[PDB]
Write a sequence for this structure.
């Protein structure tokens, strides 16, 4: 089963990243084999959303948070003025662009606008959504979404210039949970807003709503965010409680694409340490996912597909598991081909090469997608331009530790230019 | 009738995959089964009053923990007396036994631990939570310090450091059960690795059929606040979903301002989480991993649990002298409540360590005809079950008994209709 | 390790196949009953004694040939051969008598007369030819008069309509026969295996007996050894889930009737050990609906307990055979030793795979619990004499809480002393 | 629905059996190859043409009987019949030499040399009892016989007991039930057959089920119920090939025997429970860093996701098609090759349909690869494998020559 690859890659490789637990035949055996001495090796795949506020607004502090692992900056429009939020956005952009001198240092960071909330779309939300479009935000976290028409109202308020902005619906009350299917259908993703949910429904039922919503989003292949009070005590203390570390680990094990920090980064005394703690827990929890059952169940539950991007994605993930591929390099214009690979939860990192700065920021919503922004002008021959981008992903991957000489990588491309034509999977040996 | 299959997450229970099971979990599907995960409450100034202890017993406290890292022997003797007074204040059909557990100060075996363990035997404690167990010889030392008079006391080894996790298998083999002592574990190993040690230890204890306790900071914010954080409710629910037999409260009940509410909160979460367990996979995996056995108690237990699942039995009523027959039923995680009828006050207290075991203390002297004595105890289990809401007329129950008096002879399973 | 136990412990069906071993000898008693057709080659009392010793459990009388007088003589000869072993408990074996009708536009006049002959001669089973719909079964049931309601009706599926209306036929029948001879002429020959596998699967799911019939060892009508396809066919019928396997021309007119019975016995024993019980039991459990019938609930608990301890046997007390049939439906590896006072139920339970009938004729004890104990001990002592059990073995015992049929609700684990 | 698709979607093997339907017609092309023994009843060119049309894929020459001159004439007649057949529909037919048997006999050395000189594709080596027997056959084939496939016949107790060492050095196995049924108890042959088929399926190597499959058809026009069951169960067991011996070599109904195996195999292939089979084969196949192996599992997974009508693969030696076949896709594996020997030999692998490419070469290697893929599509449409609107998976490599398969592409037809 694993004997030839154990001889080739070594016993040390197979003792890391919870690989003994990954090879177990049952979920019970998988738990029994989890090992505190089995170190994570893969890059952290669950994105961290940090709320920006008084403790995390300065350019110097934002540079530290980007280095600690922040992928998405959340602006809570329930507090502060438009002037206050515009300055936060400018500071985030200055900190992000301070690393732009090279693909080895650059890390795209998405900007998300979290609305104040509502009897339908409020007048303040209309003004805040217009502010978001004018300031080029990547994502909207829509507060108190209760039905599909609430999403349509947010979409209309973004106007024709905001068509590319992702709408993540926040489920915060009983109606949102009950009408979940209709809301998910029209949203780009979901946020389990546990703060309000824990007041709107009995506190002892929140975990059921969280697990159900994460499961349904995983089945739909749409991003899901777990939010609120994940590391709450870290607002005043340098180390979290045992329940808080457990909560972050279990959100990742449940299947969350993103985890969030609110007061921990907006007002707390340890914003950088809170990001570092979520980073450390998420890497441990990602390695502990039982991929054997998860991949089997995602295949069994997902309907058959005639979409070549979907068909190539499952073949690429299956191939990555067969050879313990270090990465899956994918070319993408909108992020969709990377999202379809992410839905099958590969252990291999999905390195997404794109010319779209906005798609590079938005793909942080999908677990395990590492965006690489390609800035070179197009080659005269399209096939050469595709090859250059694949080589850019390989060289960036090698220079950044994702790839090593001798590794196998899976490369996912399409047959013609433009979004929607991904249909090729190639197995390449890194030299 | 019809609403039965809507409740207790039964639509999610019938799912063909774990992913579909999650997708079918419903916040409107109310729990019906009695809460199976026992609650351990640490005794302290917030919970020493006899009147406060009566409220904690009513709220759901099953085991009272005495932390010997604080207070003198005189202090702990008063704690024991107050717990016993509150427990004995309670109507034999509704009486709830409450175990007393002694949690040692810790270290080899210290001289203070030798004195504290002798105090425990002299005061009749049921369980010892042995601190900082690092190897099998630590358990043997605790057992020797309990002496010949403490042979019946259960030893739960607390795993609190790297060595304890690494030598886990040898420790589990000689212990009655384990406690995942997350407080010290979270200081001894990186905080971000504690969940791995917790999940591994719970999985291994579930495989071994031995009790496992999840402990420390589960509802920490309720020491000062009336409602817990979202991470705390998640932590309690995930400990139950992981497979913990018991969950614990430390500062929340010993020194905080909401000891009764903290017990009520663990009770409420545990009931919701138990209904959300995917028994289809869990039972299949426990059966597959459990070795073949020639012990009639073990063979009867798996047959009884299989029968209970076939008919959606409301309960499995088992007669037990030491608690062993109830423990062997519990290891297969039936959805049916295991109602354990015993004359041993100590066994009635100790079986709270096993998930889904509801002990009933039978006080009547033995009937002259042994089959009549067995029947009267089964009827006592039924009448208690009806009064407490476990059973109703028309329910099916599985009754587990043995072929002769004395411990060790369980060998019969019977399907009974409640009249 | 014997009885394919290394293959039994495999985690996948593919691994199970890879671990099958020609040197792993079968130990369990043969569980699939053998039905032999009685005719010119197998009618004599001396030949019938050899067929009983070789393993024949059910004698089939084909009413498409011969007179009532001819068949009455065959029945008398079978009964004389069976009773010749009534002095030795080690060799006495009940043998069922099955009447196979000539067939039909509805119930034929000849079938009414032949079914009446069956009732008058005390036959145990009817193999009803060309059953095409539920009303055909109702007609056979009505023709079984006021005296034969206890006779089992096994519907023969022999044409396209019978296959298409299978669910309605199975619902009203006691069991099914896959009558491959006519089926292979009525539908394309290359589709018969699909109908066979589907019908066996559905009968296994319903917990009703299914017989695989016709041309299983055909070449043995003239040759002393079968072809490689014929041994394969018998083994695959057992692996498919057939409760019984049948011989027609091989025993009725062939030159090697005893050898044909011996060959089916030898193959069935090898094939039964090769069954992948791990998957079979899991799938039977998952597909069977929840039940509030204590006999059904006790049966699954007893089979689960037998697997847990590798029990040598499950001893069950039964008056009608129903408690043994409900144990058989879960396909335990342990032999189901059925202790009954009903001579008819003892003959009829041969239709259920793995049921070994023991006819008990002691007068009833005044104290019911003592009468139950005496019968359980009779099953144990017969099991020891026949090689099923030894001192130290574990056995599962299934009984009810009060006398009379329909109250099975107890499972006990006993250590043999 | 057709091709037992209701049974294919079942959640358990038991439910799969319950859903099998005699009215659900097979649509896929027959995947299990038929080996027919050539003899007096099937030697003529006219008879051989009818056998090729009926479905014969491999012609077996039994060197236990007849002279070298007799077998050379049989080979010439098979080749004349094959070459009588339109490049988009041409069907390659392999020639297999079945040795007399024993260490290596002097007669076998002469017969193996005859085989090399006459360009046989396969050797069915009789009575293989250990790895050194396979080495001796390989040595007797010499340097000119390097490309010939050796299928070891397991015929006795020793061969069964030393099976793993024999399989390791052989190209495949034949379950030679005739001798096996005399060497071991007849009632144990099914265990040896099921074990050997299971182990060959795990190893990804061809396995042949042989002897007395349709025996009664030597004198009768229709087989017995046990014979149709035997053929169906060999396919369900996982056999890559099924064989006819006396039925085609000396019987009165050789063509009808081939037609009967074709009809049963098609029905049995649709009745395979792919949901369990693919999951088990995928789980048991070892992890690998070989790009052909990695591409093969990705291609089979992709084919199942979209209900692909076919997987078109370019192959020089047949290896890339064999690695796809080992995962038992429901999609036909259309193997496009320029090697006539590889086209003949790939009949040993279930579900591989060889197409011998004889179109003019393109100047640009990438255009030449594209035209070979288009040839597979056009041939597929003509033969009924593909229709406009179908999805196909295409498996190719990054450079010319064997061993470089590393690409899988999803293509919509027309
Ligand atoms: O907070 C912790 C803790 C934190 C970090 C690492 C380990 C621990 C720990 O082990 C622990 C804790 C608290 C208590 S207590 O219930 O508050 N209490 C019982 C007795 C006294 C009282 O009656 O108040 C004082 C202590 C424990 O009993 C206990 O074991
Ligand atoms: O030759 C007699 C016979 C001769 C004189 C007086 C009585 C009989 C007689 O009773 C009898 C005979 C033959 C057959 S059979 O060859 O076993 N037959 C072949 C296949 C049949 C089928 O495809 O359905 C069913 C079975 C019987 O079944 C049967 O009972
Ligand atoms: O090769 C000839 C042949 C050559 C020259 C002159 C005459 C003949 C001839 O008459 C003949 C041949 C082969 C076979 S066979 O069917 O292959 N045979 C069946 C038994 C074995 C098996 O079960 O696998 C394989 C051997 C015959 O049956 C047969 O009659
Ligand atoms: O993930 P998306 O948005 O569908 O983009 C995938 C597209 O990227 C490509 O690989 C390259 O296209 P471009 O040259 O237009 O960037 C296409 O072949 C493919 O259709
Ligand atoms: O669970 P344990 O300690 O083995 O006790 C089970 C015992 O209880 C009984 O059911 C009743 O025994 P007693 O009448 O002695 O209480 C025995 O038949 C059986 O052996
Ligand atoms: O299988 P059946 O026909 O329902 O018979 C089972 C019956 O056998 C018994 O075990 C013994 O009953 P009898 O004493 O009347 O033979 C009953 O308790 C049970 O109801
Ligand atoms: O299956 P094999 O023998 O490895 O052949 C596969 C080879 O066929 C090809 O697809 C085409 O190669 P050729 O152009 O030499 O025919 C190669 O890219 C690949 O390596
Ligand atoms: O709005 C939120 O983020 C919440 O309620 O958790
Ligand atoms: O001792 C304890 O309970 C701990 O450290 O958690
Ligand atoms: O009647 C039968 O037995 C048959 O046709 O197979
Ligand atoms: O050699 C063979 O083919 C046989 O014996 O079956
Ligand atoms: Mg909110
Ligand atoms: Mg501690
Ligand atoms: Mg008839
Ligand atoms: Mg007929
Ligand atoms: Mg031979």
């Amino acid at each position: 089963d694993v004997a030839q690859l154990t001889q080739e890659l070594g016993t040390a490789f197979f003792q890391q990243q919870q690989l003994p637990a990954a090879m177990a035949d049952t979920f019970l055996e998988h738990l029994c084999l989890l090992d505190i001495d089995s170190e994570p090796v893969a890059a952290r795949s669950t994105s961290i959303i940090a709320t920006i506020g008084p403790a995390s607004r300065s350019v110097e502090r934002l540079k530290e948070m980007i280095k600690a692992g922040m992928n998405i900056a959340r602006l809570n429009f329930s507090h502060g003025s438009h002037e206050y939020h515009a300055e936060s956005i400018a500071n985030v952009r200055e900190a992000v662009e301070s690393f732009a001198g090279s693909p080895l240092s650059y890390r795209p960071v998405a900007i998300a606008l979290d609305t104040k909330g509502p009897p339908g779309l409020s007048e303040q939300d209309v003004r805040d959504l217009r502010f978001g479009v004018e300031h080029g935000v990547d994502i909207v976290f829509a507060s108190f979404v209760r039905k599909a028409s609430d999403v349509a109202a947010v979409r209309a308020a973004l106007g024709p210039e905001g068509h590319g902005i992702k709408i993540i619906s926040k489920i915060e009350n009983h109606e949102g949970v009950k009408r979940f299917d209709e809301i998910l259908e029209v949203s780009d993703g979901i946020m389990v807003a546990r703060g309000d949910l824990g007041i709107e429904i009995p506190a002892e039922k929140v975990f059921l709503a969280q697990k159900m919503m994460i499961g349904r989003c995983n089945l739909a292949g749409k991003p899901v965010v777990c939010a609120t009070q994940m590391l709450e005590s870290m607002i005043t203390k340098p180390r979290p409680t045992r329940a808080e570390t457990s909560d972050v680990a279990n959100a990742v094990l449940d299947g969350a694409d993103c985890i969030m920090l609110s007061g921990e980064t907006a007002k707390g005394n340890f914003p950088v340490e809170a990001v570092k703690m979520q980073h450390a827990i998420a890497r441990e929890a990602e390695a502990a996912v039982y991929h054997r059952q998860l991949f089997e169940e995602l295949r069994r539950a997902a309907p058959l597909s005639r979409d070549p991007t979907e068909v190539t994605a499952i073949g690429a993930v299956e191939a990555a598991f067969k050879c313990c591929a270090a990465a899956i390099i994918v070319l993408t214009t909108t992020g969709r081909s990377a999202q379809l690979l992410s839905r099958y939860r590969p252990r291999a990192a999905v390195i997404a090469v794109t010319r779209s700065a906005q798609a590079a920021r938005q793909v942080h919503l999908c677990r395990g997608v590492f965006p690489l922004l390609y800035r070179e002008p197009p080659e005269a021959i399209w096939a050469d331009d595709v090859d250059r981008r694949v080589q850019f992903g390989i060289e960036s991957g090698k220079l950044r530790g994702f790839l090593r000489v001798g590794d196998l990588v899976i490369v996912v491309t399409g047959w013609r230019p433009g979004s929607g034509y991904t249909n090729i999977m190639r197995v390449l040996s890194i030299s």
Q: What stands out?
A: Residues 279-417 of chain B form a domain with the Pyruvate Kinase; Chain: A, domain 1 fold (CATH 3.40.1380.20).
